[PDB]
């Protein structure tokens, strides 16, 4: 995250870190949606242009973390993957359309003060909150800029959803209904954006109707980070909820 701030303790207890076993590194962000299901971006697991195609045993999931590099003894929980499910029509060839994937945990993770699942939006909540101007919140351990480098702890930044025509007019990439962009315009002054390493993490919103946090998007792509005139693009979670439900229901 660029132009964010340190997250408060237990501020994002559904935050998950996708960690490569060897060489040991942060792969992406993710989110906890139940005690055995983790949501992330498909391109975090499968991206043939860069020769990325991770299998289950290549990865680990670290839940309840704050510090980026330290092993948070007695706080963070580490889970192995049972199975990965990538959207069948995930478009890695062109524009990352339907950039979503689910990961089933080998065993349920125990909830705590630092581990707790986020909600997934129904049609009404989506209809009510996914409006241009309304702000969401993105969290991750990704880069702090485009060339410091990486944070010591989980970063957070609130960003407004941007009008679909503005999103489309800011890039040459073909945008779809399975995406939405967020961030401030050059004339707005305020800054912020997700960056490399933040992919797969959640863009949440706190419903004012029931004061619950809902994951509306998944950090997907962007041309650079926090560039004037550019916006961060996110996977439209509600639009792909039927697929999510089907997977969890069937598996």
């Amino acid at each position: 995250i660029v132009e964010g701030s340190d997250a408060e303790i237990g501020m994002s207890p559904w935050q998950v870190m996708l960690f490569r076993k060897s060489p040991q590194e942060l792969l992406c962000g993710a989110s906890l949606i139940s005690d055995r299901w983790v949501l992330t971006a498909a391109h975090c697991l499968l991206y043939p242009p860069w020769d990325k195609n991770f299998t289950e045993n290549d990865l680990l999931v670290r839940i309840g973390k704050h510090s980026r590099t330290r092993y948070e003894r007695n706080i963070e929980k580490i889970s192995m993957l049972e199975k990965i499910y990538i959207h069948p029509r995930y478009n890695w060839r062109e524009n990352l359309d339907r950039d979503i994937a689910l990961m089933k945990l080998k065993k349920p993770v125990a909830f705590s003060d630092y581990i707790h699942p986020v909600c997934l939006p129904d049609r009404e909540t989506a209809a009510s909150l996914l409006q241009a101007g309304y702000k969401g919140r993105v969290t991750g351990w990704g880069n702090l800029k485009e060339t410091k480098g990486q944070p010591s702890v989980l970063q957070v930044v609130n960003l407004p959803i941007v009008e679909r025509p503005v999103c489309k007019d800011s890039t040459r990439i073909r945008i779809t209904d399975n995406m939405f962009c967020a961030g401030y315009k050059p004339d707005e002054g305020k800054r912020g954006d997700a960056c490399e390493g933040d992919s797969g993490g959640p863009f949440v919103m706190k419903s004012p109707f029931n004061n619950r946090w809902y994951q509306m998007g998944i950090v997907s792509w962007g041309e650079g980070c926090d560039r004037d005139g550019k916006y961060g693009f996110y996977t439209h979670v509600f639009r792909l909820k039927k697929w999510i439900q089907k997977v969890i229901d069937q598996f």
Binding site: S5, E8, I9, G10, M11, P13, I33, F111, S112, D113, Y114, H116, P117, V118, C119, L120, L129, G133, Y134, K135, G136, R137, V156, N158, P160, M205, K206, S207, P208, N211, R212, W213, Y214
Partner: peptide, 27 residues
């Protein structure tokens, strides 16, 4: 179910430092 309710915030009726910014944008 209990989803989206943070143990260290909503569960204790404590607000984080910037969640108000979100609320203020839901006009």
């Amino acid at each position: 179910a209990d989803c989206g309710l943070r143990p260290l915030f909503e569960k204790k009726s404590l607000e984080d430092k910037t969640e108000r910014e979100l609320l203020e944008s839901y006009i």
